Amino acid sequence: GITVLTHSELSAEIGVTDSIVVSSELVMPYTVGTWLRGVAANWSKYSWLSVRYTYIPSCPSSTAGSIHMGFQYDMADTVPVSVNQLSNLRGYVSGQVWSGSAGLCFINGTRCSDTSTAISTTLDVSKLGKKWYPYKTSADYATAVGVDVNIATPLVPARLVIALLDGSSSTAVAAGRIYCTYTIQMIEPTAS
Amino acid sequence: GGITVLTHSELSAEIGVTDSIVVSSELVMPYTVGTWLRGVAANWSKYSWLSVRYTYIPSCPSSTAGSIHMGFQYDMADTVPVSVNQLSNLRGYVSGQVWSGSAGLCFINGTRCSDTSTAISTTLDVSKLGKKWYPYKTSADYATAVGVDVNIATPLVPARLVIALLDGSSSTAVAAGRIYCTYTIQMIEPTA
Amino acid sequence: GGITVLTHSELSAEIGVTDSIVVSSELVMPYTVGTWLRGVAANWSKYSWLSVRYTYIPSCPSSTAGSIHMGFQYDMADTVPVSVNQLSNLRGYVSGQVWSGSAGLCFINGTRCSDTSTAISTTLDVSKLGKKWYPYKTSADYATAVGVDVNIATPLVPARLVIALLDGSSSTAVAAGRIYCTYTIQMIEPTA
Amino acid sequence: GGITVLTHSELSAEIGVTDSIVVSSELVMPYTVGTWLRGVAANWSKYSWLSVRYTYIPSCPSSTAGSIHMGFQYDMADTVPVSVNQLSNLRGYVSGQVWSGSAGLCFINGTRCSDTSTAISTTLDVSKLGKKWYPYKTSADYATAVGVDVNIATPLVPARLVIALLDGSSSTAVAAGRIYCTYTIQMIEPTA
Amino acid sequence: GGITVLTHSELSAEIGVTDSIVVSSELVMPYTVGTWLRGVAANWSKYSWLSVRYTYIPSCPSSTAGSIHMGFQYDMADTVPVSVNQLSNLRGYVSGQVWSGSAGLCFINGTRCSDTSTAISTTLDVSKLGKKWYPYKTSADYATAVGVDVNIATPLVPARLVIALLDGSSSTAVAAGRIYCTYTIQMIEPTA
Amino acid sequence: GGITVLTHSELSAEIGVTDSIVVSSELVMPYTVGTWLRGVAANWSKYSWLSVRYTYIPSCPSSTAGSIHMGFQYDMADTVPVSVNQLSNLRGYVSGQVWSGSAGLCFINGTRCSDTSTAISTTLDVSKLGKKWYPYKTSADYATAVGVDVNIATPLVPARLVIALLDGSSSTAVAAGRIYCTYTIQMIEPTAS
């Protein structure tokens, strides 16, 4: 009954200022990329076999700024406010806003070799609360958080946390992009 | 160990057919599969489905107009389907004339099954349930849970059985058949 | 040594359907399974069932409304069922259209059984009886015993077959089918 | 690799019979096989059929007059059959009563198949198709293409299902049954 | 198979000691061993004891005067013993100070048993019971049966537990301890 | 891996006995098991019980009247037991004189256990839990969940330990013993402040 899918797609566009800005993304089909959102909507349940977020730069080597990424696995956790907090998360990675080219081989599934510089991070699928998660939307998450933030824990596997700081401007400078490379097991079709 | 393993078949539903579609459902949990199991499994806090099978057996003339449809939904938030087409997409979907289904009898009395291609019988994906050990809950417990949020109910009930009947010759329900449930349940952790 | 073993099939019951439920029963003992065995087995004092199977054979048109239900009770004090729901819980419960059951014929003449999924046929738990050697007793002996105490009768009769017929179209019984008994009996200790 | 392999069954056609021959057809391509798959495969550019099976399931009384016939055309330029005689020569031609075919159900839920000699079910010669990777096209794409040249359409649709209904007792269509499609499709090269 | 096998421990009797001998008893049958098993086993018609152990666990100071005595009778017609002398001859006879007996605890939670020599714990000779499959009976059923003839009861209950308390220092009952029942029961032949 | 494994014993409850049944309970989750683990496990977002044991060790004279009873509830919605009869049915039910239990000590310092039949000690069914990885939750977060719906708590807490004391000689609490908890916990995925 399992339809297995592997794909890479644009997941976020990224900019840096001279002050820390913390953003986040739900690690679930609805919010991982527009393409997967449409596809997985045809199923009621899924399971992450693999989730990877990779930052690819698009700026000069001369751009001031850095990007930081990590995972939270409990929705009730407050989003970090400092790089110091963030550095403790599983899969914390960090790099100059112009590093990360070396992550490119993950996205198109090529022979990965000199990936020491890759600003890439992967989900501990092995340690999620459960295996089969329901496909839920942002709307479903939001309302759920209103009743209890913990009702959300059985709906979403993790949250991706992102920080950008060390930039030279108060204004967003075009920095890079975050892509997601995932292998998803999609099961139990639905006509809604 | 503490696991009391039970295998049993009992009456689960009475079925009648009309000239327009009538869609019913049953939560796939001890309280609602059959009156006997309801009383037995109440003496424990938790259960685990090792096997659950719903079988339609006819009681009508071969000249009876009508068909029966059954399938499973595994997300309590799913709307119960409104057309056979929707229904046709569900896991374990089966369909037949309301006067068909006799060969499903061998499942019910646990005998050697051979010619079961005509059986209007379907089985629960125990392998794909959210967790293994579910709480014994009542219909009251479920209604209350969804009264707050439908997604609260998902860790409470493993699945729901969907039934649609249509294609009948009368606007008044004609007696068609019965659905039996044949289950193998693990019961653990008693209560007084 | 001293055991005479007999295997035989004979008519055990004639069956008709009404539109309202009728529950009948038969003691599973030589005296009441069939007239031939009654006379034969009376020549010995005690007996033991090695195998007992009751099989329904239809004799009605495919357009006949009605269904038949059969199951065993193994305690003479057990109250006879009043609903299908109840009956469905007994060991060896079987159920089908009043015009189904043809596939059971092969059990009666002891030939190679293949497609028996459709068979409205059921068998006694020889391994689960009170004792092995039962006294040959009459309905008269039984009637008397339960008159004194119903529990006195239990070591006298190995089981009772319960039958319900309903879902018919008439207020007057329509000829539906017949129940045959296929048994293997051990007869010991002759008597004059 | 890039291949998402998907296996599914869904409603493809509802079927009614009259007393004069009525011939219809269906393109064997994701867009026209079923509404669910139509939406799903739309997220990919090209596909390959590994298996497509069309199964008719009855929903009528056994006393229903009428018969259904199915076959495949593999050249889009072939003119639609007009008689049972023509239709009978097609690859995978099948034929039966409009109330027969229950035995095909095991194909639809993918269960253990035993007695399927009576199944009104037929399958595509995937091995003999014009090419392997076909483009996702709509009814619109097919329609316009044949407007320029019908031969342009052959690389666009892998095959056509031909359906005939006749032998009925009424001049008004009687509800007879349904055709389900069970397919295994290889989908490649995502598009936004 | 049809056998639902159950193992459980539960409270069966609360025990008090006086300065004169007080002889009580308990029927070793599902209804009277404990309130939990009573409810549970009621759902089946017959049972079999695989193992029954009665274990006294103390709750009084080490300075509490008194002794406890337990043994089994296997014939309902036996008069209940009147002196410790008689009681000492019964199968499974055990005896100890009313504040002794803690080491029996490992039997109750089914853990690794080591130093159990001081355990005031005793077990039923299941191999020597009259029969294997016993009917679930009430205290009421027993009462009426001996009302007719005491020996009618013998095939109804497998054995009797006999208890004597004496050597206490008070004329009024002192809280001494509790008797727990630890059983493995085979339950067969469901009933509604 | 990311798994920090810890094996430890600490005081979990002080126990006193009266002449009337007094039923108390404890959440089997790091925060409420002991003062030490609470602070330690808080540095992780999630945990897993590999083993949990509650052992009652006595501190009273051999002449102290009273008995203690312990068992597990694994469903948060279950009403707490009110009688020894009910409690006796629970998984891992143990029972004894309030002055018995000396033999459980070996479980606590992890030494060679021998004659432990008299031990008033009981263990969690880790295999039978709803899930494996539970979030670290506080009492407050727990209380809040049941205010909305008690069933929300079940994915938050793996189990509850139920405790009964009765059969005493005083109407006011007499010092009887202490309950220690011996656990092996898997702690994963740190969190800061």
H/E/C letters for each residue in chain E? CCCEEEEEEEEEEEEEECCCCEEEEEECCHHHHCHHHHHHHCCEEEEEEEEEEEEEEECCCCCCCCEEEEEEECCCCCCCCCCHHHHCCCEEEEEEECCCCHHHHHHHCCCCCCCCCCCCEEECCHHHCCCCCEECCCHHHHHHHHHHCHHHCCCCCCCEEEEEEECCCCCCCEEEEEEEEEEEEEEEEECC
What is the C-alpha to C-alpha distance for residues C12 and E62, in angstroms, rounded to an integer?
A: 69
Phi, psi values for residue C25, rounded to 5°: -150, 160
**Contact between chains at D59 and B167 (C-beta distance less than 8 A):** yes
**Contact between chains at F189 and A77 (C-beta distance less than 8 A):** no
Q: Token pair of E16, please?
A: 């008090």
Q: Which residues of D touch B (CB under 8 A)?
A: 8-11, 14, 34-36, 57-63, 99, 102-106, 108-109, 111-116, 119, 175, 178, 180
What is the C-alpha to C-alpha distance for residues C56 and D66, in angstroms, rounded to an integer?
A: 33
Q: Which residues of B72-87 are buried (b: 16+ CB within 10 A; e: fewer)?
A: bbbbbbbeebeebbbb
What is the C-alpha to C-alpha distance for residues B113 and F63, in angstroms, rounded to an integer?
A: 67
What is the C-alpha to C-alpha distance for residues E153 and E158, in angstroms, rounded to an integer?
A: 9
Experimental method: X-ray
**Contact between chains at E115 and F120 (C-beta distance less than 8 A):** no
What is the C-alpha to C-alpha distance for residues C150 and B156, in angstroms, rounded to an integer?
A: 45
Contact D105, B122 (CB under 8 A): no
Give F146: exposed, middle or buried? Use CB within 10 Å, 0-12, 13-18, 19+.
Answer: middle
Q: Token pair of E36, please?
A: 């939990």
**Which H or E element spans position C148?**
helix C139-148
**Contact between chains at C90 and E156 (C-beta distance less than 8 A):** no
Contact C9, C185 (CB under 8 A): no
What is the C-alpha to C-alpha distance for residues D71 and D90, in angstroms, rounded to an integer?
A: 5
What is the C-alpha to C-alpha distance for residues F30 and F186, in angstroms, rounded to an integer?
A: 11
Q: Which residue of A has its CA nearest to B147?
A: A147
- Angstrom CA distances, D129 to B143, D28, D87, stand at 53, 11, 20
DSSP assignments along D143-176, one per residue = HHHHHH-GGGSTTT-S-EEEEEEE--S-SSPEEE
DSSP assignments along B93-119, one per residue = -EEEETT--GGGHHHHTT------TT-
B134: β partners: B47
Phi, psi values for residue A84, rounded to 5°: -55, -50
- Angstrom CA distances, C166 to B56, C169, D54, stand at 17, 9, 38
Query: What's the gap in Å between the CA of C22 and the closest CA on chain D?
Result: 28
Neighbours of E100 (CB within 10 A): 18
Tokens 């969907």 correspond to what residue? B162
What is the C-alpha to C-alpha distance for residues F86 and D1, in angstroms, rounded to an integer?
A: 60
Contact F141, A150 (CB under 8 A): yes
Neighbours of A7 (CB within 10 A): 17
Q: Which residues of C touch E (CB under 8 A)?
A: 73-75, 77-78, 81, 85-86, 89-91, 125, 128-131, 148-149, 151-152, 154-155
What is the C-alpha to C-alpha distance for residues C2 and A14, in angstroms, rounded to an integer?
A: 95
Q: Which SS3 state, helix, strand or coil, does residue A75 take?
A: coil
What is the C-alpha to C-alpha distance for residues C94 and C119, in angstroms, rounded to an integer?
A: 9
Residue type, D188: I
**Which H or E element spans position D62?**
none
Chains in contact with A, where contact means 3 or more Cβ–Cβ distances below 8 Å, are B, D, F
Task: Please tell me the number of Cα atoms within 13 Å of B116 on its side-chain side.
Answer: 21
Opening angle at CA B133, ends B131 and B134, nearest 5: 90
Q: Structural domains in chain C?
A: 1-192 (2.60.120.20)
What is the C-alpha to C-alpha distance for residues A78 and D21, in angstroms, rounded to an integer?
A: 69
Q: Give the residue among C122, F119, D108, A152 at the shortest CA–CA distance from E107.
A: F119
C174-190 and C4-17: which strand pairing? Answer: antiparallel
Sequence-separated (6 or more) residues with CB below 8 Å from residue B182: B7, B8, B9, B51, B52, B53, B55, B107, B108, B110
Neighbours of B1 (CB within 10 A): 11
What is the C-alpha to C-alpha distance for residues A96 and A70, in angstroms, rounded to an integer?
A: 16
Contact B157, B73 (CB under 8 A): no
| Torsional sign, CA F116, F121, F126, F130 | positive
What is the C-alpha to C-alpha distance for residues B173 and B175, in angstroms, rounded to an integer?
A: 6
CA C140 vs. chain centroid, Å, equals 19
Contact D76, D150 (CB under 8 A): yes
Q: Which residue of F has its CA nearest to B146?
A: F149
What is the C-alpha to C-alpha distance for residues E95 and D43, in angstroms, rounded to an integer?
A: 79
Residue type, A42: N
Q: Give the residue among D180, D126, D179, D132 at the shortest CA–CA distance from D155.
A: D132
Sequence-separated (6 or more) residues with CB below 8 Å from residue D20: D166, D171
**Contact between chains at B128 and A155 (C-beta distance less than 8 A):** no
What is the C-alpha to C-alpha distance for residues D11 and D179, in angstroms, rounded to an integer?
A: 6
What is the C-alpha to C-alpha distance for residues E27 and E124, in angstroms, rounded to an integer?
A: 12
C23: β partners: C164
What is the C-alpha to C-alpha distance for residues A86 and A84, in angstroms, rounded to an integer?
A: 5
Sequence-separated (6 or more) residues with CB below 8 Å from residue D138: D31
Sequence-separated (6 or more) residues with CB below 8 Å from residue E53: E107, E121, E122, E123, E124, E181, E182, E183
What is the C-alpha to C-alpha distance for residues C90 and C84, in angstroms, rounded to an integer?
A: 10
Contact C120, C94 (CB under 8 A): yes
Q: Which SS3 state, helix, strand or coil, does residue D142 take?
A: helix
What is the C-alpha to C-alpha distance for residues E165 and E99, in angstroms, rounded to an integer?
A: 12
Q: Token pair of E140, please?
A: 């009421």
**Contact between chains at B63 and D60 (C-beta distance less than 8 A):** no
- Angstrom CA distances, F142 to D111, E124, F32, F156, F183, stand at 45, 46, 11, 7, 21
DSSP assignments along F1-67, one per residue = ---EEEEEEEEEEEEEE-SS-EEEEEE-SHHHH-HHHHHHHTTEEEEEEEEEEEEEEE-S-TT---E
Q: Token pair of B28, please?
A: 């796939």
Query: What's the gap in Å between the CA of F159 and the closest CA on chain B?
Result: 12
Contact E98, E66 (CB under 8 A): yes
List of chain B residues whose C-beta atoms are within 8 Å of the C-beta of residue F129:
133
Q: Token pair of E102, please?
A: 């803690």
Q: Give the residue among C50, C49, C46 at the shortest CA–CA distance from C2.
A: C46
Contact C190, C45 (CB under 8 A): yes
Neighbours of C3 (CB within 10 A): 11
D136 is in an annotated binding site: yes
- Asked if D touches F (at least 3 Cβ pairs < 8 angstroms), the answer reads no
Q: Which SS3 state, helix, strand or coil, does residue C112 take?
A: coil
List of chain E residues whose C-beta atoms are within 8 Å of the C-beta of residue F64:
61
What is the C-alpha to C-alpha distance for residues F19 and F7, in angstroms, rounded to an integer?
A: 36
E54 is in an annotated binding site: no
What is the C-alpha to C-alpha distance for residues A33 and A10, in angstroms, rounded to an integer?
A: 6
Contact A69, A85 (CB under 8 A): no
The number of helices, as runs of H, and strands, as runs of E, in chain F is: 5, 9
Give C152: exposed, middle or buried? Use CB within 10 Å, 0-12, 13-18, 19+.
Answer: buried
Tokens 């007999």 correspond to what residue? C6
Q: What are the DSSP E strand ranges found in B120-171?
A: 120-123, 134-135, 160-166
Phi, psi values for residue E74, rounded to 5°: -115, 5
CA E42 vs. chain centroid, Å, equals 19
Residues in chain A, overall count: 192
Resolution (angstroms) equals 3.0
What is the C-alpha to C-alpha distance for residues B126 and B49, in angstroms, rounded to an integer?
A: 6
- Angstrom CA distances, E14 to E24, E28, E173, F90, F176, stand at 12, 16, 11, 18, 22
Contact C153, C145 (CB under 8 A): yes
What is the C-alpha to C-alpha distance for residues D168 and D18, in angstroms, rounded to an integer?
A: 5
Residue type, C94: V
Residue type, F146: V
DSSP assignments along A23-59, one per residue = EEEESSHHHH-HHHHHHHTTEEEEEEEEEEEEEEE-S
Q: Give the residue among A192, A187, A178 at the shortest CA–CA distance from A51.
A: A178
- Angstrom CA distances, C165 to C62, C98, D52, stand at 17, 9, 44
Q: Token pair of B153, please?
A: 């109910």
Residue type, B5: V
Opening angle at CA C24, ends C19 and C29, nearest 5: 155
Contact F19, F169 (CB under 8 A): yes
Query: What's the gap in Å between the CA of B37 and the closest CA on chain E?
Result: 9
Contact B18, B167 (CB under 8 A): no
Neighbours of C164 (CB within 10 A): 24
Contact C145, C156 (CB under 8 A): yes
What is the C-alpha to C-alpha distance for residues C161 and C159, in angstroms, rounded to an integer?
A: 7
Query: What's the gap in Å between the CA of E183 and the closest CA on chain B?
Result: 12
What is the C-alpha to C-alpha distance for residues C44 and F77, in angstroms, rounded to an integer?
A: 62
